[PDB]
Amino acid sequence: AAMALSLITFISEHLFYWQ
Amino acid sequence: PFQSTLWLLVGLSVHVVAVMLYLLDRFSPALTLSSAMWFSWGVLLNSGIGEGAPRSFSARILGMVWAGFAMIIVASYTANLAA
């Protein structure tokens, strides 16, 4: 469960940092 | 206190979770692959080998609970011999 929620955090950080 | 099937399943867990670190170290928006193996191996064995402090939240957010995985598995061990 934690590693599944890990990927979302990285995507959210990457997407937010993009803009 | 353990069966034959237990070791070969927990043993393969460290490497399959170690590799997740490296993938999260080469897409950061400062850990090498070799050091990642040490950090994953060390925490379960409770030994101060090298330094494996990672960077970035996503790579670190796994490290939040990965150490805690050492707690439960080792904790149940002493529980058995008492039982």
Swiss-Prot record, chain A:
Superkingdom of the source species: Eukaryota
Subcellular location: Cell membrane; Postsynaptic cell membrane; Cell projection, Dendrite; Late endosome
Tissue specificity annotation: Primarily found in the fronto-parieto-temporal cortex and hippocampus pyramidal cells, lower expression in the basal ganglia.
PTM entry text: Phosphorylated on tyrosine residues.
Family membership noted in the UniProt record: Belongs to the glutamate-gated ion channel (TC 1.A.10.1) family. NR2B/GRIN2B subfamily.
Quaternary structure annotation from Swiss-Prot or TrEMBL: Heterotetramer. Forms heterotetrameric channels composed of two GluN1/zeta subunits (GRIN1), and two identical GluN2/epsilon subunits (GRIN2A, GRIN2B, GRIN2C or GRIN2D) or GluN3 subunits (GRIN3A or GRIN3B) (in vitro). Can also form heterotetrameric channels that contain at least two GluN1 subunits and at least two different GluN2 subunits (or a combination of one GluN2 and one GluN3 subunits) (in vitro). In vivo, the subunit composition may depend on the expression levels of the different subunits. Found in a complex with GRIN1 and GRIN3B. Found in a complex with GRIN1, GRIN3A and PPP2CB.
Disease the record associates with this protein: Intellectual developmental disorder, autosomal dominant 6, with or without seizures: A disorder characterized by significantly below average general intellectual functioning associated with impairments in adaptive behavior and manifested during the developmental period. MRD6 additional features may include seizures, hypotonia, abnormal movements, such as dystonia, and autistic features.
Domains as described in the record: The extracellular N-terminal domain (NTD) endows NMDARs with a unique capacity for allosteric modulation, harboring several binding sites for small molecule ligands that act as subunit-specific allosteric modulators of ion channel activity.
Function, as annotated: Component of N-methyl-D-aspartate (NMDA) receptors (NMDARs) that function as heterotetrameric, ligand-gated cation channels with high calcium permeability and voltage-dependent block by Mg(2+). Participates in synaptic plasticity for learning and memory formation by contributing to the long-term depression (LTD) of hippocampus membrane currents. Channel activation requires binding of the neurotransmitter L-glutamate to the GluN2 subunit, glycine or D-serine binding to the GluN1 subunit, plus membrane depolarization to eliminate channel inhibition by Mg(2+).
Name of the protein: Glutamate receptor ionotropic, NMDA 2B
Gene encoding the protein: GRIN2B
Full-protein interval shown: 827 to 845 of 1484
Swiss-Prot record, chain B:
Reported impact of V74M: Increase in glutamate and glycine agonist potency; mutant channels are activated lower glutamate and glycine concentrations
Taxonomy, superkingdom: Eukaryota
Pore-forming, as annotated region: 33-54
Post-translational modification: NMDA is probably regulated by C-terminal phosphorylation of an isoform of GRIN1 by PKC. Its phosphorylated state is influenced by the formation of the NMDAR-PPP2CB complex and the NMDAR channel activity.
Consequence of changing A83T: In NDHMSD; likely pathogenic; changed glutamate-gated calcium ion channel activity; mutant channels are activated at 30-fold lower glutamate concentrations and 50-fold lower glycine concentrations
Annotated consequence of substituting G68A: In NDHMSD; likely pathogenic
Side of membrane Cytoplasmic, spans: 46-57
Transmembrane spans: 4-24, 58-78
Effect of A67V: In NDHMSD; uncertain significance; may affect glutamate-gated calcium ion channel activity; decreased sensitivity to magnesium block
Annotated consequence of substituting I73V: In NDHMSD; uncertain significance
Intramembrane segments: 35-45
Compartments where found: Cell membrane; Postsynaptic cell membrane; Postsynaptic density membrane; Synaptic cell membrane
Subunit text: Heterotetramer; the NMDAR subunits are modular and harbor tiered domains that function in concert to regulate opening and closing of the cation-selective ion channel pore. Forms heterotetrameric channels composed of two GluN1/zeta subunits (GRIN1), and two identical GluN2/epsilon subunits (GRIN2A, GRIN2B, GRIN2C or GRIN2D) or GluN3 subunits (GRIN3A or GRIN3B) (in vitro). Can also form heterotetrameric channels that contain at least two GluN1 subunits and at least two different GluN2 subunits (or a combination of one GluN2 and one GluN3 subunits) (in vitro).
Family, as annotated: Belongs to the glutamate-gated ion channel (TC 1.A.10.1) family. NR1/GRIN1 subfamily.
Function summary: Component of N-methyl-D-aspartate (NMDA) receptors (NMDARs) that function as heterotetrameric, ligand-gated cation channels with high calcium permeability and voltage-dependent block by Mg(2+). NMDARs participate in synaptic plasticity for learning and memory formation by contributing to the long-term potentiation (LTP). Channel activation requires binding of the neurotransmitter L-glutamate to the GluN2 subunit, glycine or D-serine binding to the GluN1 subunit, plus membrane depolarization to eliminate channel inhibition by Mg(2+).
Domain remarks: A hydrophobic region that gives rise to the prediction of a transmembrane span does not cross the membrane, but is part of a discontinuously helical region that dips into the membrane and is probably part of the pore and of the selectivity filter. The extracellular N-terminal domain (NTD) is a site of allosteric regulation to modulate overall receptor function.
Name of protein: Glutamate receptor ionotropic, NMDA 1
Organism in which the protein naturally occurs: Homo sapiens
Taxonomic lineage of the native organism: Eukaryota, Metazoa, Chordata, Craniata, Vertebrata
